[PDB]
Design a protein around this ligand. Sequence first.
Ligand SMILES: NC(=O)c1ccc[n+]([C@@H]2O[C@H](COP(=O)([O-])OP(=O)(O)OC[C@H]3O[C@@H](n4cnc5c(N)ncnc54)[C@H](O)[C@@H]3O)[C@@H](O)[C@H]2O)c1
Ligand SMILES: NC(=O)c1ccc[n+]([C@@H]2O[C@H](COP(=O)([O-])OP(=O)(O)OC[C@H]3O[C@@H](n4cnc5c(N)ncnc54)[C@H](O)[C@@H]3O)[C@@H](O)[C@H]2O)c1
Ligand SMILES: [Cl-]
Ligand SMILES: [Cl-]
Ligand code: NA
Ligand code: NA
Lengths: 320, 320
Amino acid sequence: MPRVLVTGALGQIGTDLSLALRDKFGADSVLVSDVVEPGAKHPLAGLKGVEKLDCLDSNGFEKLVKEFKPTWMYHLPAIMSVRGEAEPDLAMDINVNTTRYALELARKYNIRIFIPSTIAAFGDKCGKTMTKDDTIMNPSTVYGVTKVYTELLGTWYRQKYGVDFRSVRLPGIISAATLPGGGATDYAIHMYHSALLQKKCVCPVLPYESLPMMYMPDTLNSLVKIMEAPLEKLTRTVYNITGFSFSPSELRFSIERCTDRTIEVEYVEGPAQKIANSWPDSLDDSNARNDWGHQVKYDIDMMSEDMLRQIPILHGLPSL
Amino acid sequence: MPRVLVTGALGQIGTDLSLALRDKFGADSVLVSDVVEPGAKHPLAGLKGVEKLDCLDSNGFEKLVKEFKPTWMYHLPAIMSVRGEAEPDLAMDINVNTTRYALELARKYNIRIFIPSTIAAFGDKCGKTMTKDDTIMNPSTVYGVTKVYTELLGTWYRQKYGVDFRSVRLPGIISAATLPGGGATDYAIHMYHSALLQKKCVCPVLPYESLPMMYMPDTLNSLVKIMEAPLEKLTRTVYNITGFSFSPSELRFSIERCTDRTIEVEYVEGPAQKIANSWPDSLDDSNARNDWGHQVKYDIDMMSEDMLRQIPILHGLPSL
Ligand SMILES: NC(=O)c1ccc[n+]([C@@H]2O[C@H](COP(=O)([O-])OP(=O)(O)OC[C@H]3O[C@@H](n4cnc5c(N)ncnc54)[C@H](O)[C@@H]3O)[C@@H](O)[C@H]2O)c1
Ligand SMILES: NC(=O)c1ccc[n+]([C@@H]2O[C@H](COP(=O)([O-])OP(=O)(O)OC[C@H]3O[C@@H](n4cnc5c(N)ncnc54)[C@H](O)[C@@H]3O)[C@@H](O)[C@H]2O)c1
Ligand SMILES: [Cl-]
Ligand SMILES: [Cl-]
Ligand code: NA
Ligand code: NA
């Protein structure tokens, strides 16, 4: 049974993943860290086993790893697409340097290490329909460039030092806890909020732009399941995984089915569009399904039902 | 005509490139720099416009650029395959951080920037026969991993900021001016020295491991030609270029044809072999030929003739 360290643990994936790990292996077997502390309304507030760690401080990062003695690490901090184009130096620092430090610690302390990649690692030469695990990688964002380096450097640590590096290329991840903002796939949560508030939604992604997506509970299952797999079953270090693909118009139809009313949406291109257009429409995740049993239990309508129930509970929006 | 800065200029490529640029454009229009000073017998010793610059010193790098106002830059420092496997922190520092600084300067000060890539950017999934410009990139060395990042990051600067970033994936480069080191393709240069000294060459690459190679004068022609090209003629930022491929067995025969005598070579596998085996056997350089006129004058026997005449003259080895 593992002892799990999570870094950048207070963000979108880390919050839900931290809780799930605590449930499965026990709070004493999990250490949750982030450069920031949790808000008083954050789900990890007041919990034991939550610490403050700037992963750019390699000495502090090592200090924490020595003290806790993890056998597994999920290294989550990154600056993602939209922010990274505006603040590329910060993206290069965080996405390259924290990763280098993590991998050096995984070597030194014999840690099985997960670092997520992303469909943003692909660009317009990838083959946009059912994109393969091995293909041409020509990302159009600095974030994506940094994640190609993440994939290749992690794989080198495996080959050279036997570090047990594992990764998936995550699609857009949807969850109810997330505050709608300007992220590349934030149109989807904005749309759920608008529907609940019965207000006009102005969507920055074009209506028929399809992307690979996944609902959070499926994401968490896979993130645990890949780390549990015996090494001998893994034929590669980096796997595509997907939930289902959808466009904004499809998400709108889903919401209208689950609310039984019309939501008003106007499509006005924002910064997310050019980024999303350079990404695949759908992924081939057959290697993940075959090697370690990646599976998906939600479809778009199940997800919409759950979201429309969870958002009022979490954020105080009007319910259906 | 241009004002050309060379960084990392005292090495194998830089020594001959610096002299060619001075000849072509005039000594007052070329500034060359390196972390170390030239020794008294270095071809660049005693020359004006040769300076000491550590490209990890970003303030120093900036100061030099702001003073000289280059219109072109050739950014040459890197830690290469064999050394990088043994000193990976140095390789990651030099290969990533100096590049990051050079690209930012190119953006800020409007410089046309060349940063060489390499066949080492490819690995065992590339398609090893007549490898294309766009393929799967899975390098097996940290150096190669850093060069993929170099290509993608330079290409992103071109896309995001309009930086005129140009690159070729260099094959193994053979030249006489520089004494050979412990690097992968430098077996070839050692084999010429051993032949002239009439002593045993112990070769760490297996006798039929074919690699893309090029003789320096053709390399110099192409390094200048790609930088002279009008931007509108370039359909891509990174080009494969090759001279010809050969194995150590082939080179030995070529040397023996020229020297009219046996030379003694023993093949004792070293680290270079597994690295070379993961590289292409030959490249497709059609895009370079088409777009900007890459061309090649030398074949293996013309190269061997010239190497065997030049080495005695430049280094005092036993003639003919
Ligand atoms: N959410 C998605 O749709 C998605 C999709 C694909 C891949 N990913 C990847 O998943 C990982 C997590 O994404 P997320 O959506 O949770 O991001 P997020 O922005 O919600 O969370 C990131 C967390 O990293 C922390 N952090 C930043 N700098 C740090 C540092 N110096 N030291 C320690 N922590 C630091 C931030 O405080 C934040 O809590 C990232 O690698 C991301 O690229 C996410
Ligand atoms: N030589 C080849 O066969 C070959 C093949 C493919 C690609 N390349 C590329 O060509 C470039 C030059 O290679 P080379 O063979 O001339 O290498 P080299 O090792 O002969 O020369 C490297 C030069 O860089 C300098 N240097 C190192 N750290 C520095 C720093 N911090 N600041 C400034 N200078 C620094 C060194 O002092 C040295 O003079 C590299 O990018 C290499 O990857 C060379
Ligand atoms: Cl984003
Ligand atoms: Cl080498
Ligand atoms: Na962002
Ligand atoms: Na080397």
